[model samples]
Target: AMTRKQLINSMDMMRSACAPKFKVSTEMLDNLRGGIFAEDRELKCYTMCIAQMAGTMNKKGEINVQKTLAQMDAMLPPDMRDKAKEAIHSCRDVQGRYKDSCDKTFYSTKCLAEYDRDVFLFP
Candidate 1:
């Protein structure tokens, strides 16, 4: 099991890796860890960054399931491929669930994150 500190560490690592493109900070990470959703603009934007990196969100902020699954699968080693496939596939149910692209992306990202918690490390 990932201890709270370890989970925060992973989030910190991702922030370090991604902050050049977005203003992800420890405070922002803390809010997310606290179960705060995308109501915060910074959190919403950071989620967008995560989706973009996962190849799940297109330039227009729409969910791209095929692209997401393909991109994620391409990065995984053989043993990890199926897990990524399942994590990414969870986004499908919420694809057309929202009129706002951001909400759709948020739902997809949330889906992936939850599966990550269950089946892997990162989403």
Candidate 2:
């Protein structure tokens, strides 16, 4: 349901939040968007796919990504959009993993250090 602008803004915010510690740059952000979205089809597909995945989950077992893709396919008309979704699904999986690693690395070093410093100094 997020518009393209909103999606871009969200990515910007994500990058900004991590920039200081994660060393994520605007170029990296652009590359990430371009690599995933490509001609924009993958961006739309990824947004819709993640939205559906979020909706279908309820603290239960893992989400059914394949089913989510099927649902998305049924909603779209026959065209390049479906193909984009397939490609996005593949890219999203990797992006998800990379994001996890980024978070772990960022928080483990920078965030933890910052928190410790702040706690001791402020207290």
Off by over 4 Å in 1: 1-24, 30-39, 120-123
Clashing pairs in 1: none
TM-score of each: 0.62, 0.33
- List model 2 lDDT by residue over 10-92, tens digit each: 54554444444433345543544443222233332333333333342223323345654664455433443355345435433
Query: In candidate 1, residue 3 scores what lDDT?
Result: 49
In candidate 2, which residue ranges exceed 4 Å CA deviation? Answer: 36-84, 88-123
Model 1 earns a TM-score of 0.62
Cα-lDDT of candidate 1: 0.62
Worst-scoring 10-residue span by lDDT in model 2: 114-123
Report the lDDT tens digits of candidate 1 across residue range 1-123: 344455557556666666566555666565554444446655666666766655667776687788867765555555557876887676588758877775776666666666665444442
RMSD of 1: 5.3
